[model samples]
Target: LHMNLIVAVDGCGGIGRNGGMPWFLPAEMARFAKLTTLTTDSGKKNAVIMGRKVWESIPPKFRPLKSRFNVVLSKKMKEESNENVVVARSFESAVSLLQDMENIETIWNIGGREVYELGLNSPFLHQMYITRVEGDFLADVFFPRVDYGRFIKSTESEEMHEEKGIKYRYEIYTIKTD
Candidate 1:
């Protein structure tokens, strides 16, 4: 069977900082949760690849997201007390961790900037779900600029909203290769 992987990244691709996102928008957060949840199988489990910082960003109550396998990518590759979570030394090792799982339909690249950058360069990531947030907020991190010539824009949606005197639309771009 073919493997399908989806990457969800913010406009800046800054998934977290210290322990949380560089910027927070309630609507964007809700959308992110909804997108990840919807992409997984209903009764079966899927896998999510993330950085250690991103893994730490998850709340204690949601430590191990239910009905899904969590793979944390870290150089240390240390095991946690949670059985559902696996720690890997590299991206390849992280992907290998999901090989034995049966009926796996989708793999999600949920990240901090570093992890998302890795996914962008990976041949395994077939699609990207990018949310373009408005305003030019200064960010210490950013997603690698993808060559639009290499990707086909399959779908797009936009909505306008105001926050902290800044106005912008949340734009979703679904990209695929030619």
Candidate 2:
């Protein structure tokens, strides 16, 4: 089976803050959920790989992102207490775990900066979907520098919206190795 690695990053590639999104955009949040957390036809949900910080960023009520298998990549995550949360020691192990699954349709590289960098470097990842925020806001975290030369953009869509005095456009880009 072919496993697709998907990512949803902000313009700055900031996926979390202390324990939540850097900014709130209900529409964007919904968009992310629809793309990454939704279930597929094989009765298997999408797999989400993220860092420990990103896992902690999710609220307790939303801890086990419904309909999706949540895997957090961290050396510190040893014990598996919850049904939805699984821990991986390294990037390779995380991807391996997903590969070992029986019928996984897709793997989502949900992030916290470092995780995205890891995915970008992986041969398993051949596509990326990014939402470009319009204004440049001071950010502590950022997405890894994408090697545009190695990947070609396949498609794009623009979505205009505003939040807290900042205007942004959600741009989705499909990248592939050629």
Candidate 3:
């Protein structure tokens, strides 16, 4: 139902706990910012489809992710907030409507847990750039498994990157038979 998303995962397969991230590495932050914001066409912006929780997790100051268009999946609606916040009540509607959009160049699934699962199963989700972070910590939300079980490319091995005493690497993957 979603596609071209990027995510950061820890060694324990965990993504978050208590509506926030555990690791605060600058390198990872830079990568995520670049991935979500990069423009291929230069004429149109990308779109980010996120769950209500994912939308809320972002700081109020940055709620509507700048540069790219924002698509928030929320059953409950608010009367007014920002012009950038366009809500899709259900997954099916968002997927169908997004296809016809002319301004949205690329669509990405930004996450919590449920949103990630939806993206993995979706045929439209052709690629996922997963940040493989090392170390284990108690986490309530972890990155879910993909059903396809195939990645288009990968680093021969984990590359070294560290911040605030935590270690991690970059491993990007794409669905096979795309």
| Predicted structure with the largest TM-score when compared to the true one | 3
**1-178, model 2: which lDDT tens digit per residue?**
3333444445565544555566777777787788886655768778888888877777879887877888888887677788777888888988888889865678888775778877877777756666666544555667777776666555444557786765666444445543
lDDT of the structure predicted as candidate 3: 0.78
Q: Write the residue-wise lDDT of candidate 1 on 80-133 in tens digits.
A: 778788888888777666666775556778765667667767666666666555
lDDT of each: 0.62, 0.70, 0.78
Model 2 clashing residue pairs (backbone): none
Worst 10 residues of 1 by lDDT: 1-10
lDDT-best of 1 and 2: 2
lDDT of each residue in 1-178, candidate 3, tens digit only = 2378678888788888788887677778777878888877787788888888888778888768888778888889673367766888887787777888887777888885777888777779788877777878677888787654676876577668888988887777777776
User: Poorest 10 consecutive residues of model 2 by lDDT?
Assistant: 1-10
Q: Determine the C-alpha RMSD for candidate 2 after optimal superposition of all C-alphas.
A: 2.5
Ranking by lDDT: 3, 2, 1
Local lDDT at 60 for model 3? 85
Q: Sorted on TM-score, highest at the top, how do the candidates line up?
A: 3, 2, 1
User: How many Å off is the CA of 70 in candidate 2?
Assistant: 0.6
**Runs with alpha carbons beyond 4 Å of true place in candidate 3:** 155-158
